[PDB]
Design a protein around this motif. Structure first.
Motif: not given
Length: 119
Positions: A18, A25, A27-29, A31-32
């Motif tokens: 993923t 990426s 920003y998604g990290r 968020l995670c």
């Protein structure tokens, strides 16, 4: 969405392939990492702690596999893991710092790893 759900999906998310696919990426990290911190702050408790330790071990193995391959995503994940989140984790951080010193962008990743190890 997690608040509306309030189960097993937050642990099922915690992600090598993923995270294998930069700034978005990161920003998604982030968020995670925020979701992981919200799940950590909020024999069921012992099983949840064992699952959190297993998730940390799987995340460390995924970071080692990504560093073995892939660099900038691992650095953004290292920044998010220094934001959100120990002896085996310290050994993994030392092995990652040795691999970063064995490698520019690798210098920035090693600087971020040193700043994380200072904490």
């Amino acid at each position: 969405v997690e608040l509306v759900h309030q189960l097993l999906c937050y642990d099922r998310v915690f992600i090598i392939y993923t995270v294998a696919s930069n700034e978005a990426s990161r920003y998604g990290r982030f968020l995670c990492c925020m979701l992981e911190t919200v799940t950590r702050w909020h024999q069921l408790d012992y099983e949840n702690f064992r699952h959190v330790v297993h998730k940390w071990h799987y995340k460390l193995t995924k970071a080692s596999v990504h560093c073995l391959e892939y660099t900038h995503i691992r650095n953004i994940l290292i920044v998010l893991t220094k934001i959100l989140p120990v002896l085996n984790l310290g050994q993994a951080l030392e092995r990652r710092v040795h691999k970063i010193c064995q490698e520019p962008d690798l210098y920035a990743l090693a600087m971020g790893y040193s700043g994380q190890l200072k904490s």
